[PDB]
A paper describes a structure:
In cardiac muscle, cardiac myosin comprises, in part, the thick filament of the cardiac sarcomere and powers cardiac contractility. The force produced by myosin motors is generated by coupling the sequential release of the products of ATP hydrolysis (Phosphate (Pi) and ADP) to a series of strong actin-binding states and the swing of a distal elongated domain of myosin called the lever arm. Omecamtiv mecarbil (OM) is a selective, small-molecule cardiac myosin activator that binds to the catalytic domain of myosin and increases cardiac contractility in preclinical models without affecting cardiac myocyte intracellular calcium concentrations or myocardial oxygen consumption. Here, we describe a previously unseen conformation of the bovine cardiac myosin motor in the PPS state that OM stabilizes and binds to with high affinity.
To visualize how OM stabilizes states of myosin at the end of the recovery stroke, we co-crystallized the bovine β-cardiac myosin S1 fragment in the PPS state with OM bound (OM-S1-PPS structure) at 2.45 Å resolution (using vanadate as a Pi analog). In the OM-S1-PPS structure, OM binds in a previously unseen pocket of the motor, which we call the “PPS” allosteric site. This “PPS” pocket is not only separated by more than ~18 Å from the previously described site in the PR state12 (“PR” pocket), but also its environment is completely different. OM occupies a pocket that can form only in states of the motor with a primed lever arm. In this buried pocket, OM is at the center of a network of interactions between the N terminus, the relay helix, and the converter domain. The nature of the interactions is predominantly hydrophobic, although the methyl-pyridinyl ring forms a polar contact and the carbamoyl-amino moiety makes five polar contacts with both side chains and main chain atoms of the surrounding residues. Interestingly, comparison of the two OM-S1-PPS molecules present in the asymmetric unit reveals that both OM molecules are in the exact same position and interact similarly, consistent with the fact that the drug is tightly and specifically bound. In particular, the OM drug is more tightly bound in the “PPS” site, as indicated by the electron density map, and the fact that apo crystals can’t be grown spontaneously in conditions where OM-S1-PPS crystals grow, arguing in favor of a full occupancy of the PPS site by OM. In summary, the drug binds into a pocket via induced fit and consequently stabilizes the lever arm in a fully primed position.
Residue numbers in the entry:
A (entry chain B): 5 to 201, 215 to 367, 369 to 623, 645 to 731, 737 to 809
B (entry chain G): 41 to 178, 181 to 182, 184 to 199
C (entry chain A): 4 to 200, 215 to 404, 411 to 570, 573 to 622, 645 to 732, 736 to 810
D (entry chain H): 39 to 199
Write the structure that this text describes.
């Protein structure tokens, strides 16, 4: 029964009436098909005529179409309606997958198994499927009794960890706004609730704190993650929650001081200005108007779906639960306020080509909150010190030069404060409790295309490209390698899933990052010397490198990159300065000599592309020493419409994700495998007589069961199971365990009854 | 009737030994040799049988709770029930019982935490009461050697 | 000599045409001349006397009369194959063919041999005239046919691959302790530095400086590297030397304060005490006697093969060339002297309390003076660390004193590496790099502790890196590219042993968890290892005690090692007296103050996995160093010892994948750029694959030696050698025609002058 | 007794013969103005008359002479004319594409340019070596503003001349 799930039950599994309806729905296997459609990818149809190799059918809308025999695809019988695992479908093709997902989504069932991985479609509506009752309902359930859910993936990962004695990872892929952060937080919720049957409280509150400083509204997502993160949840040898840690990657510095038309800066600025805590506005010496602060009011200032006042309470509470002191919280708020004032520092030319301050009010407020001298700050910005050899002299600066430097400093303070907060959360999450394994959760900034794509979009989209290749390598390369290495009869299948050409274009020597890195080491280099080197080395040489596709009215670009998820047009302006990240060292020295301890410590401590590439390669290795579990998030439409599916948009995501190819390797291969010793430990209970040696034991045990003997293979060190065999052996184990406990209880009842009878016999009325 | 088709295979000496045993369960004021439907299983177990709650309810003819508390039964209606229960030999091996308890052994060592076994026995299968578990269990650190425990429950 | 620009090195690199002919015409019969197994020499040469019913009776080279089965007899390679340069070219490839080719080249002092795409080198234990600027000059650009096997040849090929493929390279030098990894690492650097010729001078001097502080005499090597290192040599887009950097890994801290019977501490201590620079002894307030200093005199103090006086001059000069100031050099010498005094500080228990107090102040005074500390503060910090003070017994103070000396030394070594890197960094643009890996090699002592596990685990991981690249990734490459290929299991996989050491519930993991239990003992750690692995993990066994006692055995790739687990918890945690660390931060010596401004197994495992990724993004080139004997005897080969190394290295399996597979591959575009010259008509001036098919099909070559992949053309190494000879000859013919045309132009220019005087 | 030049058929028109006779005469360095050339200045007269033979090809028509024969063995126009006819027969003089592919070997970055000093080195060290004098005369002028040669433009230049 679905009774243990409460109100969530209909949103997780269809009713008994509906499965009786599916079981008795009339169907014509010869008539009921799928045909291509120029606007909907594929449509359902009934064949009218049929022929000479041509089929004439009646569409579900419905029009009359005439297509070739080869273009027609069979529909799965009604028994397969809203199927939980799409690897179990009789006919596996693009519209079978699409229509199974569409039909489950129409019923608000947003999770579907795709063999050993999961597919999830964004509902754009909150459903009652994520509460402690549903967490408890799933605790220990492995498929059959458990409908698809993020809690199921999390639980299955936990069981693999204990059985296989290896570290796990839950890798959540998807475009911007697909649902990666939502699902990441539900994996954490699962493990924290299970542990509560505080570290659990602190693990949950780490994300509201980070999202305030690292998330922002973009054209694609109202709560877009502007940094990547890997959360490791540590466990003891017997599986008890031990500790946690967070690793963050490359925060988008430019958002602090710049916003595009339909974008907001980081949430925190608007959370403070909401006036929910009026004492913060007084402490930071600010008004309640965002249009008064230059760095923060370039794009949008309010979001219909966000209550900045309520979110400020969530942020401030998250810090309290995380054990941040009043000085810690106040120092963070004060530095945020200092950044706000810093942007309002105005400058003018002296008839000379040198900048001087316009006013001093905002500089005074900035310096006061930062524990600096404003006369020193303004002199440092207008006349930075330069070393000749023996003496210290000043450099000249025009307004454009000071404005650039003012921004660079603000971004450096913000990014370092974000880094401090991560380190401070980690100091809390660390328990000194013994660990043996971990379950790692990966939440990257997803694939995105804006009207204007710069360096930050390249870094983001490169990370997404690398993650899809990680799926491709595990599913189609390492998987087939495993069979061969173990002596399983296997013929290699080429799945056509390899993004090495594009990855090589970006990260290998003479690639985009390498050319950029070399150009940064040339003092006379410009954006256009960089644009020329890219063209000279890649146009007509690298297939993924193309000319831009510029349109009048829309912002122009310098080149196109054919990424896995689409072609992105990139603008190369300011990439050298962005990669080098120069800072005014005169002002940095004032920050080091600051009377505000947090600021003093932030600056006490080569290029962005070098560091990004290092973090990515480090990440890819931590993940290679892990058993990965993929969650493929899908955006249903481009208008944030709940329950609405845009067929071409969903199909494009399923294709570039390699969902079908992924299901195929699960169906054709042997997705589950266990060492002979571990097999004996777990499945001897099925028939102890067959195992009174470990390989012969497995051969005797399995051969003694009423199963399809073509569904398992014997390897050098492991038994390999076909898709569906594990699910059967798990049902058979559970039923047999239930029968044995019942017999242990019957025997126990006999003992107790015989004990009391002995008392009666000894003479006791 | 279903009890009427059953053949009494016990020796007259065995019948009388079950008859003498049956007397200790008789709580009737006039000593008319009668037990309630609800105490049948307890007498079956006293006489060496180990039926499940489901098996007892089946020989009783699927009774209601009211029939269990207040419906009476004499030795003549009980004896055919004892014969039927005596026929079942698929009571589970020592190896099945060890394999069942081994599921809860988190490590190698043939031990299980006392509190876990008490929980399993009171929540899974045909649930034992917290009273029955306390009486049965009364452990080393607070762990049970489940292979010894199986030998213990099977000897008793 | 003939085709030698190699000078005096020529006979040590390639034999004369006179020897080539004596070999070729020597007595030999293919039916008689074979190899038979031998219980003492692995295999021996033999001549078949009789053959009956599947049994062969032969005459040994020593010679005895043996009777063996048909299946045990192996064919000798004909005289044409004597001392062959590449063993992948041998007609019969088996264990004695490889062994005897290597033995015969070694007998001629030819220590380098190609093994397909990798190289084998046997330690000569004698310096040969093969590593000079003249030999460097002679290898520059030479192909494997015009260039005899040498470390300069591997280095140059790596350089060519880098420019053609546009990818980073690595030269990975494997071997047991004393095999020759550091020698060959330094010759890779010499090659690139000489080719470029102060960056060149500084790159060469970085190793004498590091070796003084990071190398020491062990029972296996008089100059044993006690740290690992990865040297990256950076190059510009066109291949010009740009910069260099050094990454060092885990220096053996314990050597600073402890030595086993047949061992010395780090070289520097003995270099200073040599009295070659007498002003250092006066500056450091020390005598010339190592037996006066506790920390450094536990084992041996002199090495016959080392002149500590001459080596001190090499160390001091290396620092000068590296641009270290007088304050930088003096601070390093002073801290070395401070460590020497620190070891001589004695303590005793108080009369009525289990609390330590100083037993003398002389060596403490000298230590504090050189360290810019107050000795009253130092002694109070060691006896009463602040928490209000903690109590300390003599055993506790002695341990803490040692831990602080090791921490100063290791951090000073780390500072020196950073300071060398600051010099090696030129702000010159770069595009590629050639990385050189020099690890501390496989070793077995009478007493093996935590430091031997870390060392031998690194060696185990490196052999698996060879196994993965050669037999896994290689076969994977053919499949992903659509080349007809049947998977071969080479029996080269050390995952079981690697899993025993680094995976959850393994040796490192159990140790890490035990460190998080305050009540844990070495014996509680020994119990957990046994409970989880004895009779569960094949590579984990009981110790084989005879002399010092061990707790377990580990079946490593290169042998079974017996490990002693005493003090592993303290070694892994590495606790330090924070009160003394605070005095070092407040030190009047800038160096010590700058130096001090989770576990060893966790950090080691992180460095190893970081290293394996930097290496996975490079094209690797393996150099397999072999120890010939156990007595450091030049020109002497111990057959079982050489064979054991060739086996556990997988040299034969490695040659086989090169022969059977397609070791060379090139993208279609790059193939057109390089080989269109062979026949430009076949590729008129779209489509790059069709172009390659037309070009290759148009040549008088074996068409079974290349295959067309999705993105690349795959070649047999032999076919690549032929195509490179064909390209060079065709380039020589084209230049000759360009010169003939150029001569015609010049002659026509002069004729125009003559004509203008009389006819025009 | 027979000869290899005797079997060669003179296919040039009488007008062509007389044109070649005057060209041969302009190379005269004899003290008596006898209108004869040394064996060593034959290549020059072959090249002046539009041929582009290699040093090896010239030495073959001359009958593999010694250096002494090259410096001092005299030759009349009648012995020269059959040699000019033989050299005129060779058409495998190398294509424009071969010449570009040859110089492309030295293009380190795929520019379509080669460093001046490298081309001067290659031409003076590889194949049938040119003298440092011949290379200076051939290269000037010249390299571009940076000191590089657009090989392919250089090939068009040497083939037009
Ligand atoms: C369907 O329900 C589940 O998800 N589970 C139920 C029971 N499982 C326990 C247990 C049974 C038999 C085999 C697996 N080991 C697994 O096959 N190995 C794994 C390892 C690496 C790769 C790439 N593929 C496969 C083992 F965990 C754990 C989950
Ligand atoms: C002196 O003899 C040589 O070794 N060389 C001759 C010419 N080479 C230039 C060029 C020609 C043809 C193909 C290769 N590329 C190479 O095969 N790919 C390489 C890269 C990945 C891995 C694991 N194995 C194969 C090459 F670079 C450079 C050296
Ligand atoms: N499972 C879900 N239930 C409800 N809303 C969701 C769900 N997944 C996504 N959303 C909505 O979509 C928004 C964007 O999702 P998010 O996890 O931030 O995307 P990503 O991290 O992939 O960019 C969320 O803020 C929420 O409004
Ligand atoms: N190529 C060689 N030429 C001369 N001596 C060598 C050579 N290789 C090794 N040796 C000798 O062997 C010793 C140990 O070599 P080394 O590089 O330190 O070994 P490893 O670093 O593998 O332990 C050297 O000090 C030297 O005496
Ligand atoms: O919207 V995202 O969180 O993918 O950046
Ligand atoms: O002797 V070694 O350099 O291998 O440590
Ligand atoms: Mg997100
Ligand atoms: Mg070494």
């Amino acid at each position: 029964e679905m009774a243990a799930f409460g109100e969530a039950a209909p949103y997780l599994r269809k009713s008994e009436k509906e499965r009786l309806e599916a079981q008795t729905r009339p169907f014509d296997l010869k008539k009921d098909v799928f045909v291509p459609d120029d606007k909907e990818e594929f449509v359902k149809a009934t064949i009218l005529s049929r022929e000479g190799g041509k089929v004439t059918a009646e569409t579900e809308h419905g029009k009359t179409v005439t297509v070739k025999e080869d273009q027609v695809l069979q529909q799965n019988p009604p028994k397969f309606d809203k199927i939980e695992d799409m690897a179990m479908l009789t006919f596996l093709h693009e519209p079978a997958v699409l229509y199974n997902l569409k039909e489950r989504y129409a019923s608000w069932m947003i999770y579907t198994y795709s063999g050993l991985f999961c597919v999830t479609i964004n509902p754009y509506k909150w459903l009652p499927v994520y509460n402690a009752e549903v967490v408890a309902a799933y605790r220990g359930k492995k498929r059959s009794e458990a409908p698809p859910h993020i809690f199921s993936i999390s639980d299955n990962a936990y069981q693999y960890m204990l059985t296989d004695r290896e570290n796990q990872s839950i890798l959540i892929t998807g475009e911007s706004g697909a649902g990666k952060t939502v699902n990441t937080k539900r994996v954490i919720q699962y493990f924290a609730v299970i542990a509560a049957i505080t570290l659990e409280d602190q693990i949950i509150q780490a994300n509201p704190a980070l999202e305030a400083f690292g998330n922002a509204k973009t054209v694609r997502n109202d709560n877009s993650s502007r940094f990547g993160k890997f959360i490791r949840i540590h466990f003891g040898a017997t599986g008890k929650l031990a500790s946690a840690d967070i690793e963050t990657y490359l925060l988008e510095k430019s958002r602090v001081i710049f916003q595009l038309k339909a974008e907001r800066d980081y949430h925190i600025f608007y959370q403070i200005l909401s006036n929910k805590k009026p004492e913060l506005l007084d402490m930071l010496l600010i008004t309640n108007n965002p249009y008064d602060y230059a760095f923060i009011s370039q794009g949008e200032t309010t979001v219909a779906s966000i209550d900045d006042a309520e979110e400020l309470m969530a942020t401030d509470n998250a810090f309290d639960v995380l054990g941040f002191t009043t000085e810690e919280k106040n120092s963070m708020y004060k530095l945020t306020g200092a950044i706000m004032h810093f942007g309002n520092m105005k400058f003018k030319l002296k008839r000379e080509e040198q900048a001087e301050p316009d006013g001093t009010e905002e500089a005074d407020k900035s310096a006061y909150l930062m524990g600096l001298n404003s006369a020193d700050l303004l002199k440092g910005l207008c006349h930075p010190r330069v070393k000749v050899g023996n003496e210290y002299v000043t450099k000249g600066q025009n307004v454009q030069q000071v404005v650039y430097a003012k921004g660079a400093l603000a971004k450096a303070v913000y990014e370092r404060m974000f880094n401090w907060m991560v380190t401070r959360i980690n100091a809390t999450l660390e328990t000194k409790q013994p660990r043996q394994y971990f379950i790692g959760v990966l939440d990257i900034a997803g694939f995105e295309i804006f009207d204007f794509n710069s360096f930050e979009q390249l870094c983001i989209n490169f990370t997404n490209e690398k993650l899809q290749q990680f799926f491709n390598h595990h599913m189609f390369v390492l998987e087939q390698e495993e069979y061969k290495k173990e002596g399983i009869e296997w013929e290699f299948i080429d799945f056509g899933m390899d993004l090495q050409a594009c990855i090589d274009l970006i990260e290998k020597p003479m690639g985009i990052m390498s050319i950029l890195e070399e150009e940064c080491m040339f003092p006379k280099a410009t954006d256009m010397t960089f644009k020329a080197k890219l063209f000279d080395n890649h146009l007509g040489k690298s297939s993924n490198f193309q000319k831009p596709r510029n349109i009048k009215g829309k912002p122009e670009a310098h080149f196109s990159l054919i990424h896995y998820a689409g072609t992105v047009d990139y603008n190369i302006i300011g990439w050298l300065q962005k990669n080098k990240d120069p800072l005014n060292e005169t002002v940095v020295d004032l920050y080091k000599k600051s009377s505000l301890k947090m600021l003093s410590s932030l600056f006490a401590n080569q290029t962005v592309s070098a560091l990004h590439r290092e973090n990515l390669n480090k990440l890819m290795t931590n993940l290679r020493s892990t058993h990965p579990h993929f969650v493929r998030c899908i955006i249903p439409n481009e208008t944030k419409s709940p329950g609405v599916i845009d067929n071409p948009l969903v199909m494009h995501q399923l294709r570039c994700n390699g969902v079908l190819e992924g299901i195929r390797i699960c169906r054709k291969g042997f997705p589950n495998r266990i060492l002979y010793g571990d097999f004996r430990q777990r499945y001897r209970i099925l028939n102890p007589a067959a195992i009174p040696d470990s390989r012969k034991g497995a051969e005797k045990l399995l051969g003694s069961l009423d199963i399809d003997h073509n569904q398992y293979k014997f390897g050098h060190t492991k038994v390999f199971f076909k898709a569906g065999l594990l699910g059967l052996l798990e049902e058979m184990r559970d039923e047999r365990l239930s029968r044995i406990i019942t017999r242990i209880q019957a025997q126990s009842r006999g003992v107790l009854s015989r004990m009391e009878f002995k008392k009666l016999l000894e003479r006791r009325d | 009737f279903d009890p009427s088709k059953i053949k009494i295979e016990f020796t007259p000496e065995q019948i009388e030994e079950f008859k003498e045993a049956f007397t200790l369960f008789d709580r009737t004021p006039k000593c008319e040799m009668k037990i309630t439907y609800g105490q049948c299983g307890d007498v079956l177990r006293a006489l060496g049988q180990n039926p499940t709650q489901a098996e007892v309810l089946r020989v009783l003819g699927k009774p209601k709770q009211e029939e269990l508390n207040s419906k009476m039964m004499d030795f003549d209606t009980f004896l055919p029930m004892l014969q039927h229960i005596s026929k079942n030999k698929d009571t589970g091996t020592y190896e099945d019982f060890v394999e069942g308890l081994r599921v809860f052994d988190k490590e190698g060592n043939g031990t299980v935490m006392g509190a876990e076994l008490r929980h399993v026995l009171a929540t899974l299968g045909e649930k034992l009461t917290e009273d029955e578990v306390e009486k049965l269990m009364a452990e080393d650190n607070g762990c049970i050697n489940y292979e010894a425990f199986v030998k213990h429950i099977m000897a008793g």
